[PDB]
Amino acid sequence: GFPVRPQVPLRPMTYKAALDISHFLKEKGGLEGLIWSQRRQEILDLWIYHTQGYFPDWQNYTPGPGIRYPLTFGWCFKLVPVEPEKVDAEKEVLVWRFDSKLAFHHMARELHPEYYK
């Protein structure tokens, strides 16, 4: 009778879950153009944790400067400078941007193959 429903089962992010969830957010227009922040991404990651069970350790991006590409193949959002373009990547303001080609092209792995061994 405890009135809180249990946490849904936990699992690591996969290509297909990232693809599926990217496309859902695209249909809803949920992230497109939104200024990135640590807190906003946390709300995003925790919403996926809560509704689907994915540990929030997957949504990482290449270090920049410039466009930041997703380390997780299948996630179809990248982060794009909205005030381009700076030398210090930590000063660049970014927005989420959907890119359909990220479903087929692992851009992060081509720019930074060292992350993948």
Epitope: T62, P63, G64, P65, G66, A89, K101, F104, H105, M107, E110, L111, H112
Partner: nanobody, 114 residues
């Protein structure tokens, strides 16, 4: 060496196709890019073509520019449509390694008037 050509005088709304011939330097395992520099301003990334032929573009460049590569010739091209005066710049080709631009040419001048 990286030697770009194709630059010239363009009327607003016109098109231009740029071309780079690359020497050295192992080309087929190189991510390639086009950048541009206006006068006084800071260099701006324009387009990227990845080792496996995958592409990306700046915002200001949209569905106007198209970057392509041809592996038989150590060559990379940039098709530019619907040109505007703010596209005026020196355009150059570069090799991208990780987050940095390894090599780059002196470039070719594009001047768009209205």
């Amino acid at each position: 060496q990286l030697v770009e050509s194709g630059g010239g005088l363009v009327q607003a709304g016109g098109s231009l196709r740029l071309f780079c011939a690359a020497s050295g330097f192992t080309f087929g395992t190189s991510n390639m890019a086009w950048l541009r520099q206006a006068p006084g301003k800071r260099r701006e990334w324009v387009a990227l073509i990845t080792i496996s032929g995958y592409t990306d573009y700046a915002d200001s460049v949209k569905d106007r520019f198209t970057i392509s590569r041809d592996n038989a010739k150590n060559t990379v091209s940039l098709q530019m449509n619907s040109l505007k005066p703010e596209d005026t710049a020196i355009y150059f080709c570069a090799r991208r390694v990780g987050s940095e631009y390894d090599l780059w040419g002196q470039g070719t001048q594009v001047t768009v008037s209205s």
